[PDB]
């Protein structure tokens, strides 16, 4: 009824605990009101719209799990994000991406070398500095900031069989950016458990020692699961 309307904006809170308890309450009374016929209260109060909103792009296991349980109890379907299919791109999409991020002054060079999505996702600093013309380290740092923002929000489904992206995202959302370096080199979820650090450094292109160490321990812990 009208009491439920007070619990409708609380979810917009900045802190975690408010969101957690709001989701626990709504999901619990959804489970209560689910067996009877009255499920139409969620329709006309418009809480379903906020739930269908917040489930996508959320890295919070408790609230997202509760929202999924609430939606699947009402017989609806959970949404999923619509991410760019970066590793199957051509030069036109690369150039419009360069228009979008603001590096429009380099669109000529990226056209002459015919850089596409597979070549975009495997760029290093030598290709940037020597032949693409980004001389200043500040500009390369800005470019890599934008690139690593893109790489965490791509769609690797056309090339990732073993679903490595979710395994990397479960550790830390910042880690998903490495998935293409693990797949093009050949790895997968089954044979991951016996890689060395020195192979992670130059083949998979992981540079931060902390990320190498966390990935190594988390992989090596999943030692002989099959």
């Amino acid at each position, epitope marked *: 009824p009208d009491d439920l309307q007070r619990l409708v904006p609380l979810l917009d809170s900045n802190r975690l605990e408010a969101q957690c308890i709001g989701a626990f309450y709504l999901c619990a009374e959804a489970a209560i009101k689910s067996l009877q016929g009255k499920t139409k209260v969620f329709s006309d109060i418009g809480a379903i719209q906020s739930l269908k909103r917040l489930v996508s792009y959320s890295t919070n296991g408790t609230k997202s799990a509760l929202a999924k349980r609430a939606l699947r109890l009402l017989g609806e379907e959970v949404p999923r*994000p619509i991410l760019p299919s970066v590793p199957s791109w051509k030069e036109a999409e690369v150039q419009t991406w360069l*228009q979008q991020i603001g590096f429009s002054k380099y669109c000529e060079s990226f056209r002459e070398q015919q850089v596409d999505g597979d070549l975009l996702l495997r760029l290093t600093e030598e290709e940037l500095q020597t032949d693409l013309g980004m001389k200043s380290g500040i500009t390369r740092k800005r470019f890599f900031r934008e690139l690593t923002e893109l790489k965490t929000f791509a769609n690797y489904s056309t090339c990732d069989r073993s679903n490595l992206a979710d395994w990397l995202g479960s550790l830390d959302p910042r880690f998903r950016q490495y998935t293409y370096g693990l797949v093009s080199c050949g790895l997968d979820r089954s044979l991951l458990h016996r890689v060395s650090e020195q192979q992670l450094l130059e083949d998979c292109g992981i540079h931060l020692g902390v990320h190498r160490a966390r990935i190594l321990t988390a992989a090596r812990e999943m030692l002989h699961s099959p």
Partner: nanobody
Amino acid sequence: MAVQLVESGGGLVQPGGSLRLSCAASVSISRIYVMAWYRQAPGKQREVVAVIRYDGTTNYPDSVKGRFTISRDNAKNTVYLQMNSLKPEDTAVYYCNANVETWGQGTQVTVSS
């Protein structure tokens, strides 16, 4: 699966004066990562005029800062562009853009008597 975008608005106005363009999609906008508006003048190539992400952070080029404004509307799946103070050189065909790949068809916009 392939999202379809349709624009609306356009036409012609006088120098000085506002207009609002609308772009409607086939799915929920709140699932799409980025959406953007693009502008192609006759005799030149395309360029960006506004972008907006899933969390509602927007970037504008320096050319049109303060004069344009992009917003999502979650009631009906539609992204709006608001053009407040117009110049004579702001006449072109405008396109709506989903993530990167998918385009719209465009709407012509002209500014004169």
